Structures are given as C-alpha cells and as structure tokens.
Amino acid sequence: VAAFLKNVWAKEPVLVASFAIAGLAVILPTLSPYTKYSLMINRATPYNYPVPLRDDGNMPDVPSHPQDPQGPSLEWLKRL
Amino acid sequence: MMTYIVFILSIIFVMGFVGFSSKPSPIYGGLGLIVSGGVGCGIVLNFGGSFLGLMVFLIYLGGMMVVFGYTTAMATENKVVLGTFITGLLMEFLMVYYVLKDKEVEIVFKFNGMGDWVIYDTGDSGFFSEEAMGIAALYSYGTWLVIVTGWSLLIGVVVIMEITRGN
Amino acid sequence: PFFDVQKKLGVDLDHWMTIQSAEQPHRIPARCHAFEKEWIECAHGIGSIRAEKECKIEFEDFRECLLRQKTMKRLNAIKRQRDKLIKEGKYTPPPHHSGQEDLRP
Amino acid sequence: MMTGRQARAPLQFLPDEARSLPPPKLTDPRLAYIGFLGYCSGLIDNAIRRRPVLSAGLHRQFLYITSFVFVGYYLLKRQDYMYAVRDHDMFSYIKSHPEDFPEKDKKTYREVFEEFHPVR
Amino acid sequence: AKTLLHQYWDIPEGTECHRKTYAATSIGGASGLVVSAYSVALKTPTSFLEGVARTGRYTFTAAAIGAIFGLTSCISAQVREKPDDPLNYLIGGCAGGLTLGARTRSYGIGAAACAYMGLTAALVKMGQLEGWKVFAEPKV
Amino acid sequence: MSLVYMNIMMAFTVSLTGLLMYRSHLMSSLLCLEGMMLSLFILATLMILNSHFTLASMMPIILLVFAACEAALGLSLLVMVSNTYGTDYVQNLNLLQC
Amino acid sequence: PGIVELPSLEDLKVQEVKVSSSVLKAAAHHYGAQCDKPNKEFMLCRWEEKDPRRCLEEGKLVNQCALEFFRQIKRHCAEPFTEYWTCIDYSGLQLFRRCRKEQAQFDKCVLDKLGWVRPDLGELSKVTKVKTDRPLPENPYHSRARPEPNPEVEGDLKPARHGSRLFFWTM
Amino acid sequence: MNPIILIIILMTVMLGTIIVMISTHWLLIWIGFEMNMLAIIPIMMKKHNPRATEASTKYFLTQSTASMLLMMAIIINLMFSGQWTVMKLFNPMASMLMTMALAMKLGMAPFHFWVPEVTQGIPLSSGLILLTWQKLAPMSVLYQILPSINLDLILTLSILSITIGGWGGLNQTQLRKIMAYSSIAHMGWMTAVLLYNPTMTLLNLIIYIIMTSTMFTLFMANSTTTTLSLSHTWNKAPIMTILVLITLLSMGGLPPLSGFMPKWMIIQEMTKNDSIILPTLMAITALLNLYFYMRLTYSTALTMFPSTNNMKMKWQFPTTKRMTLLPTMTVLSTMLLPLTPILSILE
Amino acid sequence: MNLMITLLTNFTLATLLVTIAFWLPQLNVYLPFSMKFFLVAITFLLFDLEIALLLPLPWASQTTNLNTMLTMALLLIFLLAVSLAYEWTQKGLEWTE
Amino acid sequence: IMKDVPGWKVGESVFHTTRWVTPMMGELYGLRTGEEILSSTYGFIWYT
Numbered sequence A: 001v002a003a004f005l006k007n008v009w010a011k012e013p014v015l016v017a018s019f020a021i022a023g024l025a026v027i028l029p030t031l032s033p034y035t036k037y038s039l040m041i042n043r044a045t046p047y048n049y050p051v052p053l054r055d056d057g058n059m060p061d062v063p064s065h066p067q068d069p070q071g072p073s074l075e076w077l078k079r080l
Numbered sequence B: 001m002m003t004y005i006v007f008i009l010s011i012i013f014v015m016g017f018v019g020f021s022s023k024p025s026p027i028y029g030g031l032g033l034i035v036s037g038g039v040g041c042g043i044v045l046n047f048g049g050s051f052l053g054l055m056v057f058l059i060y061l062g063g064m065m066v067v068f069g070y071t072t073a074m075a076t077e078n079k080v081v082l083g084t085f086i087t088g089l090l091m092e093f094l095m096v097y098y099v100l101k102d103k104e105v106e107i108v109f110k111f112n113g114m115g116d117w118v119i120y121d122t123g124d125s126g127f128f129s130e131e132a133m134g135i136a137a138l139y140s141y142g143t144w145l146v147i148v149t150g151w152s153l154l155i156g157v158v159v160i161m162e163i164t165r166g167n
Numbered sequence C: 001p002f003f004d005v006q007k008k009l010g011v012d013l014d015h016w017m018t019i020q021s022a023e024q025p026h027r028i029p030a031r032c033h034a035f036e037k038e039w040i041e042c043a044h045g046i047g048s049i050r051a052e053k054e055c056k057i058e059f060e061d062f063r064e065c066l067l068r069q070k071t072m073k074r075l076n077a078i079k080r081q082r083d084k085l086i087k088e089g090k091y092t093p094p095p096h097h098s099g100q101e102d103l104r105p
Numbered sequence D: 001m002m003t004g005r006q007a008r009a010p011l012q013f014l015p016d017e018a019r020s021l022p023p024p025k026l027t028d029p030r031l032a033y034i035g036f037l038g039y040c041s042g043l044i045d046n047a048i049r050r051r052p053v054l055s056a057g058l059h060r061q062f063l064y065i066t067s068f069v070f071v072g073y074y075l076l077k078r079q080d081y082m083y084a085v086r087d088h089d090m091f092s093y094i095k096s097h098p099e100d101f102p103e104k105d106k107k108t109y110r111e112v113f114e115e116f117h118p119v120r
Numbered sequence E: 001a002k003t004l005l006h007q008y009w010d011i012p013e014g015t016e017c018h019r020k021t022y023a024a025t026s027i028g029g030a031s032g033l034v035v036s037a038y039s040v041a042l043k044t045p046t047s048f049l050e051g052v053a054r055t056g057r058y059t060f061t062a063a064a065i066g067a068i069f070g071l072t073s074c075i076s077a078q079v080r081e082k083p084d085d086p087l088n089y090l091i092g093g094c095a096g097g098l099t100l101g102a103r104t105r106s107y108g109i110g111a112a113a114c115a116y117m118g119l120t121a122a123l124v125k126m127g128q129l130e131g132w133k134v135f136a137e138p139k140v
Numbered sequence F: 001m002s003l004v005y006m007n008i009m010m011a012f013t014v015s016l017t018g019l020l021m022y023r024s025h026l027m028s029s030l031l032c033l034e035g036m037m038l039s040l041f042i043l044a045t046l047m048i049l050n051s052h053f054t055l056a057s058m059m060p061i062i063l064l065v066f067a068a069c070e071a072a073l074g075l076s077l078l079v080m081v082s083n084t085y086g087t088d089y090v091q092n093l094n095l096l097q098c
Numbered sequence G: 001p002g003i004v005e006l007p008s009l010e011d012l013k014v015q016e017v018k019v020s021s022s023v024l025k026a027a028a029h030h031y032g033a034q035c036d037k038p039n040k041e042f043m044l045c046r047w048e049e050k051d052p053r054r055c056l057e058e059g060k061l062v063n064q065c066a067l068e069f070f071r072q073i074k075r076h077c078a079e080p081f082t083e084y085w086t087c088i089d090y091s092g093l094q095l096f097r098r099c100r101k102e103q104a105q106f107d108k109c110v111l112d113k114l115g116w117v118r119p120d121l122g123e124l125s126k127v128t129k130v131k132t133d134r135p136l137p138e139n140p141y142h143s144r145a146r147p148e149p150n151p152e153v154e155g156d157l158k159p160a161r162h163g164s165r166l167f168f169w170t171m
Numbered sequence H: 001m002n003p004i005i006l007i008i009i010l011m012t013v014m015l016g017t018i019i020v021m022i023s024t025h026w027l028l029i030w031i032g033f034e035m036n037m038l039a040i041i042p043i044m045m046k047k048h049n050p051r052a053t054e055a056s057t058k059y060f061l062t063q064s065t066a067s068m069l070l071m072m073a074i075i076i077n078l079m080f081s082g083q084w085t086v087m088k089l090f091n092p093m094a095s096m097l098m099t100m101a102l103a104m105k106l107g108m109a110p111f112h113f114w115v116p117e118v119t120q121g122i123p124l125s126s127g128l129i130l131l132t133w134q135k136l137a138p139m140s141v142l143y144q145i146l147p148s149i150n151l152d153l154i155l156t157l158s159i160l161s162i163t164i165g166g167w168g169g170l171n172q173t174q175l176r177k178i179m180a181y182s183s184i185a186h187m188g189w190m191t192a193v194l195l196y197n198p199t200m201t202l203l204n205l206i207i208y209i210i211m212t213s214t215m216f217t218l219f220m221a222n223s224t225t226t227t228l229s230l231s232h233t234w235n236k237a238p239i240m241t242i243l244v245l246i247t248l249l250s251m252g253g254l255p256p257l258s259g260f261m262p263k264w265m266i267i268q269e270m271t272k273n274d275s276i277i278l279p280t281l282m283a284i285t286a287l288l289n290l291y292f293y294m295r296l297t298y299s300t301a302l303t304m305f306p307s308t309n310n311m312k313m314k315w316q317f318p319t320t321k322r323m324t325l326l327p328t329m330t331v332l333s334t335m336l337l338p339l340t341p342i343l344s345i346l347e
Numbered sequence I: 001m002n003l004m005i006t007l008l009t010n011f012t013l014a015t016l017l018v019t020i021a022f023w024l025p026q027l028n029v030y031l032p033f034s035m036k037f038f039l040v041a042i043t044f045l046l047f048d049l050e051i052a053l054l055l056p057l058p059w060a061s062q063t064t065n066l067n068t069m070l071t072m073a074l075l076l077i078f079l080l081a082v083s084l085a086y087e088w089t090q091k092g093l094e095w096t097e
Numbered sequence J: 001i002m003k004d005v006p007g008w009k010v011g012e013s014v015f016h017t018t019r020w021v022t023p024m025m026g027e028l029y030g031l032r033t034g035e036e037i038l039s040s041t042y043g044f045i046w047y048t
C-alpha cells in the first residue's frame, strides 16, 4: 500500500495525478464547509419576479415592504 | 422576402436533401448532408435555438459527418441521380408555388402559406435563455436520462470494440 | 405490458418531461400552459373513451393553441381581403399601420 | 379490459382485497395437476441426461414437484382473484345501470307460439 | 381504393351495366397495379420495357377479370330479374376465372379459378346481404 | 400548421425514400439514415422552441447523441462488410437467400 | 365563438414614463423602495386576474406613481441623478459597479434632501404581502364544469360464481 | 467474447426492453429500443463470419429505419398533443407510422423479409433471443397504443403475416428459417386479437415464447440447424425426438396440447366481436404451419432416417450441454391446456 | 443579420482569392484499409457525444439541485473515463496509442 | 376592412374559452409593415 504507490508514482505519474485529482474531486465537496453556501447563493439569486401574496390578515412573517425586518435576509452573503 | 427567411432556409434544406438522397457518390452525398446540416442549423438559430444549432455544427457536422467522410475516404478511395434530383426539385418548387399562390396547401397535413414569423411569442424571458435553462436541467431534472444515455455510450464503446475485432 | 415500476416504487424517472404544464426550470411557462392544464384537469381519471367526447372543447382549444391553425386562417382571410381592397383602391392603410406614429412607452 | 381496474395500485400480484377470498385448498385438483407437471419435468430431466428415470435424483424430482406446487398455488390465487374481480365489476355495473338491464317478462309456453316443422 | 368499392356497391344489381362494368374494371386495374408494383419490386425485370410489359400484362389481366366479372354479374341479374341473388356472382366469378385462364392460356387454371373465384364472389354477395364482417369493429 | 414544418417533413420523406431506394453503396444508405435523423432533430427543435417547452429542450440533444452512436455502429458494420468484399456494395450481402 | 372584448383607445391613454432604460436602472432601487405599494398591487392583480384588461387602472396607478417618483427627483436632485445615469448609460451592459461614486453622490443627495434609504442586497427580491380591496378571482381560468368521475369500487369481494365459467371448467 | 462483457451486454439487451416496458415518456421508449439494438448487435456477431455480419447489417438497417419512423411518429404526436405520454396517439398519421415501425421491429409481413435472413445468419442462441425476447418491447408498445391503432391496418398486417409465414415455412429445410416463418405467423395471430382483447395477445405471446424457447433449446441440445441433421437425433438421443414431436405438435395448435390454447382463445375473442370469417380463415391458414411442423416430425421422430458410421463414436459421450429449463419448458409447452383459465392472471 | 453579412463577406473574400489563385497564372502560356484509423475516428465520435453531454455544465452549476447536479456531472465524466479505461485495457489504443 | 365579407364576425375569438389568450406575433403585427415585423420577430436573434 506504500511500495505500490511509490512504484506507480515512479512509473506512471500522469495516472497517479489523474486518480488523485479525481479522488479529490469526489470526496472533498462532502468535506467542505462552503458547499452549503453554494446552494444558498444559487437559491438567493432572483431570476423571477417575487409575486406578492394577498394579505389575508394573518401572515406575520411575510413583510409588507422590502425594507421591513421580516423576510429572508442576505447579511451572510454580504459578510461571509 | 426577409420575413420568409426561415422558409427560404427550409427550401434550401429540402434541396440539399434531394441532393444527397439521390445518392451521386457517398462523398458528394456527405457534402450535401453537410450543407443541409448548416442550413438546418440556420433554421434552428432563427427560432432562437443557439445552443442546439451549435450542437448541429459541433456534434453532427464537426463530429459525426467528419467520421462519415473519414470512413468514406477510407472505403471509396449518373442518369438516375440527375433525374431523381430534378424530380425532387420540381416536386419541391411545385409545393412552393402552390403554397405561395394559395397561402394554404394540404399534402398530408394542412399548411399555412404565410411567413412563419407569425407563430412566435411576443414577450421576453428575462435574464436567461429558456432553451439554455432546459438543457441545463439535464443535470438537475434529467437524472434518469443522463444514466440511460451514459450507459448507452459506454455500451456503444464496448460494442464497437467487440464487433470490429473479428475474434 | 406497461409495468408501472415508477408508481410502484415511487420514483420519478420520466414524468417530469412528459407534459408542458409540469414543473419547469425557473417557473418558465409553456405558451399553452393554461390550455394544457385545462385539458388535463378535464380529462383526469374519467378514462380516454369519456375524455374523447367530454373534453373535446378544452382539447380543441389546446390544439389550436399548439398549432394556431384557426388563427393563421383568420389572419389569411383578413390579409387577403386587405390586399384585394388595396388592389381595388377601396381601402387605404392608416398611419399607425404604415409606421408613422412613434409607439407607446 | 380490466387494466384500468389494476392501475391505481400497480404491480400487485395479489392485492389486499384478494385476502377477502378463500384461498385454494392444498388438495385443489388444479394444484395437484401442477404438481404432476413438476413430476413430469423431473422425469424428463432424468431422461434427457440419461439418468434412470424413476430412481435417480429423488431430491431433484421433489424440488421440481415442490417448486411447481409453490408457483402454482400463487398463480391459482391470482386466477381466482381476477375472476372474482370480473364478477364484482359485472354485478356493480348491472346494479348501477338498470336502464340497460331490464327485467324481461318471462312467458310460459301456453302463450309462446313456436312454429312446428314436421319431420316426414 | 375504398371509394372504388363504394362506387361499385352503391349501384343496384341489374340496373346500370356499363358503370358497374367500369367500376369492377377499375377495381381489377387497381389490384393489378398493386400486384405489378410488388412484382417489379421483389423481382427486378431485365429492362424498363420488360417492367412496363409485366405491369401492363398484370394490370390488363386483372382488369379484364374485373370487366368480365361485372358484365356477367349484371347481365345475369338482368336476365333473371333477381338482383339480390348470389348465383349471379357465382356465374360472374366463373366468368372471371375463365378470363384468368384465357390470360394464362390454360384450361386447368381456368376451371380452378372458375370454381374458387365463383365461390368467393358468391360468398362476397352473401356477406353483403347478411352483413358479414371481415374487419369487424371491436364491440366487447 | 406553420410553413417550415412542411419542408422539414418533406425533407424527412425525401431522405426516407432515399433510404428506402438503395442504389449500390451502404454508405449512401447510412447518409440517408442520418439525414432522416437530422430532419427529426430540426422538427423536434422547432416544435420545442415554438412551444417554450423548457424541459424538452434537452430532448433533441439526446436524439442527436443516441443516433450518432447508432451511426457509429452502422459505420462499424459497413467496415466489416467492407473487410469482406472490398466494397460496401449492398448486392454482396445476399448469402442469406439460402 | 364569442367576440373578444378589448378596451378602447381612450381607456389606454396614460401619461407615459418617457425616460430611457439607463435612467430607470439608475433610479431602480429607490423606485422599488418608494413606489412599492401600487407596483405590488398591480403585480398581485396581474398574477391573480391573468388578464391585462382586468389590470388597467392599477397599471395606471403604476404609471401615476412612477412620474411622482421622478418629479421628486427632478425637484431636488436632478444633477447628481443626471451625472449618475449618464455614467450608467455609457456602459454596454450598464454596470452598477462602474459607477459607484456617482451612485454614492446620488444616494447622499437623496438621503439628505428626501430621506430615502437605498434597499440592501436581498430586499427587493422578497415576497411581500399586499392588502387589496378587489375580490379574489374565483375562476381566473374561466373553466367550465369538470366531468363527473367514474364510480369507484366498493363492497366486499365475493368469489366468482361457479368459477371461471370458461366453457367447461368448473373452477 | 469475454464472459463478463457477454453478461453486461445481455443485461443491456434486457435493460433496453425493460426501459420500454416501464417508461411513461416516448423518448424513453425510443431510448429503450436504441439501447436494445445497440446491445444486441454483438450477440448476432458472436461467431465472426460473413453470414453473421450480413445478418447484423440487415438487422441494423431494418431496426434503424423502424426507429426513425418511430421517432417521426413521436414527433407528430408532440405536434398534435404537446405532450409525451405513452398512451393513445393524437393523430392517425402518427398512429400509422408507429404501427408500421412496430411491425418492422416485429418483422410482421410485409416487413417480414429480414426475419428468415437474420435468423439464418446468426447462431441458435442469438436467434432464440431474436425470436422471443425482441418481440417483448414492441408488443408492449402496441399494448399501450391500441386505442389509436387503425383496425384495417393491424388486421391487414395480421392476416398478411399469417399467410406469408404459413407459405414461407413450406419451402424450408433450414431449421432457423422454419422458426422464423413460424414466428411471422404467430405474431400475425398476436396482432389479430390485439384490438379485441390484448390479454389474449399476452397469452399468445407467452405460449409462443415457451414453445419457441423449447424448440431452440432442443436444437441447441442436439447441435442441429438443418432438417437432415435433426433426422440423426433418433440414433443419438431418442428422448429428444419425442420432445421435438410433442413440441411441434403443440406449435401446430393440435389439442390436447398447450399451443391449441392461444388460437382457441383468440377465436373465442374474435367471434364475440362478430368476426367469423377472419378467425376461420386464420385457423385454416395455420394448417400450413402444421404441415411443415409435421414434415419435421416425420423426418425426426415418426421415421428413422439413415445415419452414418461415425455416430457410433458419439454413443460413447454424454450431452454436457446445459439444457437450461428444457424439461420445464417441454412440460409447459405441451401439458398446459387443462390449466387454460390461468390466463386471467394476465389481465 | 450582421453575422450573415460577415459570413457572406468572409466567403466572398475566400472565393475571390481562390478564383484569383486558380486563374491569375493562367495568363502565362508556359490504399489498403487500416482498422486503426477507423477505430480512432469512432473513439473520437463516441467521446465527442460524451462531450456533448458535458457541454451544459457552466449553466448546470447554477441550479438549486446541486447535490444531484454534482453527482450526475461527476458520473458523466466518470463514464467518459471508464470508456477510456476500457479502450486502454482491451488494446484499443495501440500502434496509435 | 371586413365589411364586404359575408358571415364575418369582427373580433370573433378562435377559442371556445373566454379566458385571455396571450396574443400571437401575427395577431399583433399582421397588419403592419415588414420593417416592424422583422424587428419584432428577429431583432433579438439577429442582434450581433
């Protein structure tokens, strides 16, 4: 497991680099703390119009204005 | 005349198909199918399919017809062809003459003779190409489609290596 | 033999691309989304034999959205009568159908 | 025909309503015939491999019989289920459409005139 | 060619002999053109002239069968004054079989085609009478 | 329906009659087959772009890929035929009549 | 079928916002802050009615509230706004990031003379709630009555009477 | 061929057919057919001789043409319906093109002309796959589109397949062409009952697959591809002659055998729909099939043809061939008629 | 439209230069089939189809289904690598490696 | 225009539903000149 790796690194370093880069491509997004922020930035990007809701009378979490406190915020993206 | 540009490109498309389908030689047939692929790309580009038209250029013409002309150059090195070509050309221009003098025709289906600009949408898509987003959704929504296509391509590699070996 | 493995296992292998009124990327509607939704909600569950006769109005509206044959035939009739009246001289186009009015917004 | 009946719950060999039905007995003559077919398969399996037909591989003959009886029991359960579904749908459709299934007036043969044809 | 059969069967038997003869001739000509098309398809003739000779031969053979069939059937319906009678098409089918034997220049093929085509045309008349269906619509 | 669909269908039928009437070469048959595929690509693409049917935008690519893989298989068969007789003439492929 | 009902040319007359798209993009964030309410009333009406003909008056309120937005810029801060949208207008993609100091001068003059705060990153993309007096459309698709479904299966499943009844089989 | 590669390729043949059977989208139907054809081409070129390359080329051309016609039918359906659901088609032109494409994939007459050539060109195991497993996917597509199948087209294809498959097998001495024309006639019987009752279509398909797999397994077990090599079987394995006798009498539909079961039920479903002439002429035309089956039973089991001297060497060696499921298939292909009402499990 | 003008101008300049080069000096009086090349062309075609599957990735990274997208992207590049590894180990990449 | 034409209902919908349908390109620009038609239907596609 150690002589084999040195043998293939001496003979075929292109393939050793290929399997190492591919293995780091596979396993490292599951170990990265910033993989969550990729999803958050993609869902925080407003391609569509934010179609407003009819105020039935009881929606305390939905704002009446963009500059109201309630609603989803992007302070994490300005700060990071 | 310029409002009929997709129609004119489609006429050139049928003329190219009558060109190679009359089968003069597989190299001139390859050339006719190349010219047809280019003008069909132009049709697709004029309906707003930029990526699909560039796939006709990159994959159909630049990938597959290259291999066709390659195999043809490795394998290869009339009156029926010319009569068949003028037959298909006269059939196509009789179709053109009828659907232009009548603004309607019926070969098997009913066809309008107006310029094919009339059917389009009158809005916008914002900050995306809808065709690009639907092709991008192959990785998000088309998981089973990715699986069956990639498995068929791997099997295609294996099948070509089996049948070309002779052992 | 349509073995309905997708409904049996609860997996969605290909229902997503099946209709235009399904969930699209970025909520992009098809041009005939309302007509297809009306025809699907009409014909749902009643079987194809009853759907041929009982949902004919929604299906004809949806086919005419998809191919626009009646619309193009009507535009053919209007444009042909207009060309006949231009040739007879019994009509003149207005300035807003000639390009002399500097559009709205 | 009945393919929309078993389409709300697909790929069920025996649905849950099939358990309302009495199962086939183990002395069902159809099931005994399927066991006989397993015994015949065991005899042909000895015959084509040139084994002594009745004597060789009694474990194999018994697994032939057992496997055919095992598959055939569930096949008979599904058979009886599908004919029960057929009759249930028939009776529910007749009960829901009385205008299509009227009660015909039965006449006795004192009123019924039949033409006589002499054999002479 | 479904309208060819319709314009054959729309006319009553023993009423208009020339148009019944022409309609049966056209049915025979269409069948001969189909046979000629598959004949020059699956068996390549040695020339274009041999191909059009085979096409004209098969088309005129089947058209003469149809012509003499419709003529003999309508004349037998006129002289017997029985339009709804399969014996008329029995005689017409035997006349068409004798025509098929005369085109192939043989008597045995003529008698065999007389018998089988006469019984076939009699069965077609009986099926038109009692409403027998060959391509029956699914009903149950 | 719209006027371009007439020509794309007519292109399909022209390449269909080319593929259903061989002259001599197997390669010309494969070219007519891929012309049929090209016209199916164009017709599918014009429908899907006209309808704004977003998820079917990936459909013609799939239609391209599979069929070009099919074309690859066809070329390989042709080559093995051409490794038997020297040409790709369809009249050499008649051993199976008996 | 029926005659389509179009509003007249008098019912479509409104005082237009005759400014270019760089002017609009330069004023966009303060416009989304200040003209929030009639815009969201119009877009709620536009997604609920699914018909532009039913949304004209609200749309006119949009075209009434935008102009009052620009006049209040024209009365107070015409020159920093002009210097800012000119710099926006130079660019081919009309970048905000090329124009940050003219933006800072415009935001300074607007926050001083009018008290308007520019919205933060994320605020104008929020889904808000709108209080309307118009009723909810009960049938916006104008759908007719759906066909009645087929009767379901019910009842206990009894065995088949005398079996399969297939020609001579008793089971 | 590498055995691992053989297993992956056979699983890919199975996967293509299974994708056809389980998918609700027309593109995945078409993908299943493409995957199936691509994977089955090496099974036909397994032995690498010019007859297999010719058979694979003819198979490729017919199945590729059918695949393009299928995709055009799908595309016309998308025009006139805006959707991709595998259900009835919404245009009669698309219905005609899809019925033609599926008839070409089945090799139904007058698209039958590849089936004896391709079956003769390939080994017995790959012709077993071609005549049994490759019918399964197009029959399932025909099953789902039957509300739009034109009646006159499918019945024309059915009777034309039954007549042409009957007359085609009369002239044959090669066993693979006999099985191919027998296949053409049995597919005609399957499509004739399709619009009336597709459960009887499934019954005829299953009984045909059992009997055809039995006959191919007997031919593989005796290494016989001709009538005259099959006639040596009595002097080598006399039980195999009894098995080919009972299986060929069953494929002729003679009661009390199991192959009487489909056609009887098919007639039982065609006369309920007031079609009397058509199952009558179909059953009389199947006597042609029974005639060349009887020819094979005369040459193999009911007479003893002359053998050769070298046969005495083969008396000293037992059959080491895996005759997989051959006693089970032989029993199911012959003794299943008392269990005829089991067909309701196919509903 | 500007693109069609540019393509027409490039084609016209190329045809004009070719017409000059074939008709300006007119003023003065004065193979066996190789299986290996076919196999590398078919390997190009198959990997080019696999590339056509890989081409919407810069747009596919913009999705909100990133776990599925990353899985399918790595699976397609992996199947391209398995195609190459099968081509390698079965001596398909030999004498033109 | 459509006064001489018998049986013509001006503004007759081709749809059975009375729901608003998004206007087609030929419905809006059908009676206008070819420059406006070409702009509104191929301007974004042909732009650069």
Ligand SMILES: CCCCCCCCCCCCCCCCCC(=O)OC[C@H](COP(=O)([O-])OC[C@H](O)COP(=O)([O-])OC[C@H](COC(=O)CCCCCCCCCCCCCCCCC)OC(=O)CCCCCCCCCCCCCCCCC)OC(=O)CCCCCCCCCCCCCCCCC
Binding pocket: D027, D028, D029, D030, D032, D033, D036, G168, G169, G170, G171, H256, H337, H338, H339
């Ligand atoms: C308290 C807990 C414990 C209680 C225990 C109670 C039982 C104690 C005793 C244990 C044994 C019981 C056996 C089962 C009951 C009796 C079944 C029966 O006979 O049904 C009469 C059945 C109908 O008569 P039935 O008078 O209306 O009913 C009397 C009972 O109520 C019949 O009852 P069912 O109305 O419920 O019957 C139902 C239905 C009644 O049937 C029907 O609804 C009519 C349709 C029947 C099928 C017709 C098929 C026609 C085409 C194929 C012809 C086959 C070729 C002939 C055979 C070739 C040689 C192998 O049967 C079927 O659907 C099954 C199909 C036929 C199989 C019968 C059972 C066979 C088991 C043993 C097999 C051994 C080989 C036999 C020969 C192979 C062929 C069967 O008779 C026939 O159809 C005639 C054939 C005779 C059948 C076989 C006789 C069984 C005993 C054979 C022993 C000797 C074997 C010799 C060696 C092997 C042969 C070489």
Ligand SMILES: CCCCCCCCCCCCCCCCCC(=O)OC[C@H](COP(=O)(O)OCCN)OC(=O)CCCCCCCCCCCCCCCCC
Binding pocket: A008, A012, A015, A016, A017, A018, A019, A020, A022, A023, A026, I078, I081, I082, I084, I085, I088, I089
């Ligand atoms: C799991 C991660 C994802 C893996 C898949 C994606 C890979 C991305 C790169 C694409 C590679 C595709 C083609 C690979 C072909 C492998 C087979 C091969 O090359 O075998 C032959 C070779 C000996 O070479 P030869 O045949 O003589 O060729 C002439 C040159 N001497 O034999 C050799 O040289 C032996 C090669 C195999 C051993 C290499 C070990 C490298 C280990 C790196 C560290 C660990 C990385 C983590 C992943 C585990 C890898 C085992």
